Design a protein around this ligand. Sequence first.
Ligand SMILES: NC1CCN(C[C@@H](O)COc2cccc(C(F)(F)F)c2)CC1
Lengths: 50, 1034, 150, 100, 50
Amino acid sequence: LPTGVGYDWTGMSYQERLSGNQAPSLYAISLIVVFLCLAALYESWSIPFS
Amino acid sequence: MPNFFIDRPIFAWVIAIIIMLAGGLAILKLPVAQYPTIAPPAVTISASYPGADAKTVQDTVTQVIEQNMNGIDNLMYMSSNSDSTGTVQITLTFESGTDADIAQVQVQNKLQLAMPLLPQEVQQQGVSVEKSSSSFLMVVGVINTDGTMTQEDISDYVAANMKDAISRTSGVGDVQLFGSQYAMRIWMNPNELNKFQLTPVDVITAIKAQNAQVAAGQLGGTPPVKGQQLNASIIAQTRLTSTEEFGKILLKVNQDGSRVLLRDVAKIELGGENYDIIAEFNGQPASGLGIKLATGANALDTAAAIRAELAKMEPFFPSGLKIVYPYDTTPFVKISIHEVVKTLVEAIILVFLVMYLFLQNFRATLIPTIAVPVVLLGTFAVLAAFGFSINTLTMFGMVLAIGLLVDDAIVVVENVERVMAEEGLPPKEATRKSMGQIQGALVGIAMVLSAVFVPMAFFGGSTGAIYRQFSITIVSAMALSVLVALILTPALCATMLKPIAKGDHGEGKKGFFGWFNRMFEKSTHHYTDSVGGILRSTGRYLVLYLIIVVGMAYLFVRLPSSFLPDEDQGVFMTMVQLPAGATQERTQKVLNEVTHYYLTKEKNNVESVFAVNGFGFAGRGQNTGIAFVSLKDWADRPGEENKVEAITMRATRAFSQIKDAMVFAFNLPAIVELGTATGFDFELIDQAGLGHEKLTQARNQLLAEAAKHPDMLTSVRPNGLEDTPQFKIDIDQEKAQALGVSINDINTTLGAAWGGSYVNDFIDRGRVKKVYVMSEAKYRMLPDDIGDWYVRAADGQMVPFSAFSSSRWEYGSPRLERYNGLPSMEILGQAAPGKSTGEAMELMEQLASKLPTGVGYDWTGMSYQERLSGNQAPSLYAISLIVVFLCLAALYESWSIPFSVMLVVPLGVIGALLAATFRGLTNDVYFQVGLLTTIGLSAKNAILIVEFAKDLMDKEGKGLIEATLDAVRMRLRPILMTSLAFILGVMPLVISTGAGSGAQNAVGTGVMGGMVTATVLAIFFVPVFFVVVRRRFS
Amino acid sequence: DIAQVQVQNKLQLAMPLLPQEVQQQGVSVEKSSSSFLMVVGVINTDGTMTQEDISDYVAANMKDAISRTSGVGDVQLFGSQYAMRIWMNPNELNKFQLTPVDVITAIKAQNAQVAAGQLGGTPPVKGQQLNASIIAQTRLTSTEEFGKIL
Amino acid sequence: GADAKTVQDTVTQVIEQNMNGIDNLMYMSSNSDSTGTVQITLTFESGTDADIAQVQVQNKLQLAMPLLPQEVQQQGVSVEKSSSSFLMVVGVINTDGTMT
Amino acid sequence: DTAAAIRAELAKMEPFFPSGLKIVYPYDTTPFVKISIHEVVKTLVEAIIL
Ligand SMILES: NC1CCN(C[C@@H](O)COc2cccc(C(F)(F)F)c2)CC1
């Protein structure tokens, strides 16, 4: 479009964009948390990695 | 717990990783501000009644609003000012912890119901309720370097183009315009008005009639006919848009057929809504935006965003328009926080170096280098959890807690090291033995330091809010340090430390390290022998301890008290006060002299001067002014003579020679949200409707009586303006009726001509702007100009003001004050040197008790806080002392041994007091928190010494003297190395002289002195206390 | 607090439609118990003050501060504050061909405080040396000035 | 009686000027109608206390209220928690046909 | 607490009253509350003694 006209998402689309944006960080944090829990419980890094 | 995590090092590492991740998340998400919310929440009501004196505003606005300020929750007090400029300013102060949003909504809601009772002009101008408990994050000035734009033009441009985008910047909480939009000014000529048979009333009526918005209707609107096909909105008369349109307004058509327009009887232009205040930046016209930071926002990021937005704006500006920053204290905040962070990092590095010097082991040194940062990150996480921010108080509290953190890490690592070097056990078994030795002591120490530091969180008022930051920070740091010492440090010792031979303690090494080991062994032997000799003659050293306690009490009573050190923030202020009746031009001349002096005699130090003519502090008028002087960067102002204190002293000395003006230069308070010192704010209330004159007489009597006590009260002065001449127009309404002149017309003519009248709005370039009608300046200057104004009568003949009104000169107040809804006068003072604030307050109460009947008094401001939180300290610390005794008795399973530990407080207190006294520092907040930290470290050392001694006495058959000597021998090294690390860490704070050096010196000098004397004295006084206690109570 | 906030937010929509007398008297929104926390009476032992004098003293010197005390939800004055009372005589109004409308207009015109402006007010002319507030008609303060209203 | 442009410049712009700086504000959308009506919906972050947000919006709206036309003030500027979806529609008819 | 605050405010007012003016408390249930709670506390102490 011409210069000076931008866009944005509002309402349902805003929430959809937020969910999509924050999904990968959620996955990374959950994987890290599970890895740390396994390392704490089984007293190892090999078992968490496997 | 220590044994659990020695077999599970990975679980300890997982806990540490969780703590570090939480701390990092907090650091990324924490707010940053110079100070937290310290002032009690306050809500301020502002109204304007143009052209009105103080009494008119007070009787028509102030009292009406004050009589409706009922049913508002958590209100400490209320005060109000009514100024001769026509403005009422009412401040309602609520208790700390009150929800500022709820207080503001309640205040405005009670005012919305009071609104119908106010004059229509006040309603038209609007009454605004705001939060005055906060200050400006930044001031962005806009100047014109070509002279093509006046102050009004710059203000209008800033309003139209800059205010919106600045307000939309992230983190910006509020934007106040230093100016106002354009206003359609109608400058009336009384001669032309009389020539064309007109008055100001006619001008206002014509403007209202011919400049309005009319609701027209709609074509084919519902309910329509059964065959309508077109529906359109009808547009009709709309507001005017240009000065030419206003000039064409028709006032009357003469009999001969001539047309009288508005331009015929007046000049039409685009001026300002108000002309009371003129802002200049280095002598050039200037406008500005005052930006307040939003709640929970990062001050540094917000300032950076504001600057980025301004830089984006720069290209589109009209030629000659420039952006300046007269009040930029953000650099001070940045440098202060950076200095604190550098202090923390250098403290960690020095801990590493001292650990390597004393233990000569790389992994042992690494262990604290891991432990301490974990505790710091956890402390950041804890601050974020409880809704705290990164500010000066919290960061200095962290600096203070570094001592305890490093002490814990050093204690654990050094004890494991010593067990390895003595018993020859491997790292795991040695760590088990060490933690079995010291874990109960660590837990008891955590409890004791909790008892020591928690009570500060329960102080009341602004001082209590200040102390709560340190309390929470240090308590969280200490708790996390203890948890780390119980969880991670044992695991790190068990997994990282290498084995050491049974008999190896560095003697066989060569070089500097071998020499140091031999010297330390010899010093330990000498110290052990000296302690053994001391224990044979404990009575002499008990007498010496009594001497130390007496000296401590003497120094404490002789040490002056304060709140916060005054800082060189790169800016300061200069107030100009001219005599009563001085006009804007005289104040402008004086401010020009001040600006010339600052830009010539201090050109090497001053970067710019922002002179505001029209309002100073504690008043606003043509005779008052304020200049905000900005200094160059500290790197460009080296030496004591080039700092704010010296510059202000020199400027005041230079300005003392200015005649017919009081010009006084001074520095900002530590927290600008409070104007506070070692002084008192006192209110003298008219409790029986005596009147203004009797209240003035009572105030004068009180001032004389206070001046008759120079040894206790200093500079007791009123915080207000004296009565000034006023011009009274006494209208004889009988003559007006006889001449057929309506008194309403007379009053409207007088007010519109001399006071100015707001008529209605108009749409300029798509923005609503006010329309003002006022007399042209030439005809409303002097009393004689009153004769130039005529008013039509019922007969149609003009009558002069002299025909139905007389004039004279009287005396009246240019500023009327009320406290708690009653007339009042404010008196500021301070206790004389060597006298406490409480004594000055008591003397002022005694002097007030001898005042005329019907005159009461009250304490407001900091005096109110003093009167509430007066005796709370000693009780809070008697509770703390009792809880410490109980915790120590639990730890040692003895009702008497706790005293041997508790008797160590004076050893550090005396050193802190001596260091403060020699350097001349005061008993301020930073000194007190450093004193508490020194007491905590000394108590920790004494607790460990007594624990070792009692363990030797009980778990082994060793005697009292033998156990004490062995305990002190074992504990000498960790004590000395921790003290060395902390002292070297605080050297930069002690020696600092740059930005933020006031707080740095206040924190560092007391810590240095207390730590030095605690380390020196405790190492041979704690054994004496333990031996004496065990002998007397066994 | 929120209940009162919402109630007042709805009431400020109706306020413009209420009669001007109701607005001038003052619409109030309280959040208080329906029963008195206490009753603070005021008497005169010497007997030198009438009930009206005591009521006026309580209203003018005691009621407002008590209403501002925290926790006080509502205050009911067992009496009333003083006001300047004009007891009209219809026979004398008819004698001079006057009505209560004329009396009210005269009171409004001759008992007022007017913003009269300033000497040397801003924007001033160059060389202006004097700045003073102009004082004009002030509100009457006694029961002798109202009696002199023409 | 004011078109969309005039009411926008006189009301909507003035009101939305002061709406910046309110806590937890995701965004805001306003519309100005030819009948002089103005709506300004401020959508806050999920989990925000709606009552506190309404109180803050009222506090910021006071700073603009006196700057609006007197006709607006006579009609009244309302601030209230809003929803954009109908929970239900309850219709009413007459089965006799007697009522219009 | 509100009754205590009211009494404190009245105490602040009294010094400036006209001659003969006096404050009385024709209706106040707070004394009943004080004596009731005190009586229950007394019964507790006597119960411990018994
Ligand atoms: N109509 C307008 C005309 C222009 N001025 C502007 C001055 O207020 C700016 O001066 C300052 C600068 C910095 C801080 C302050 C503080 F003290 F308020 F924090 C005041 C106000 C009224």
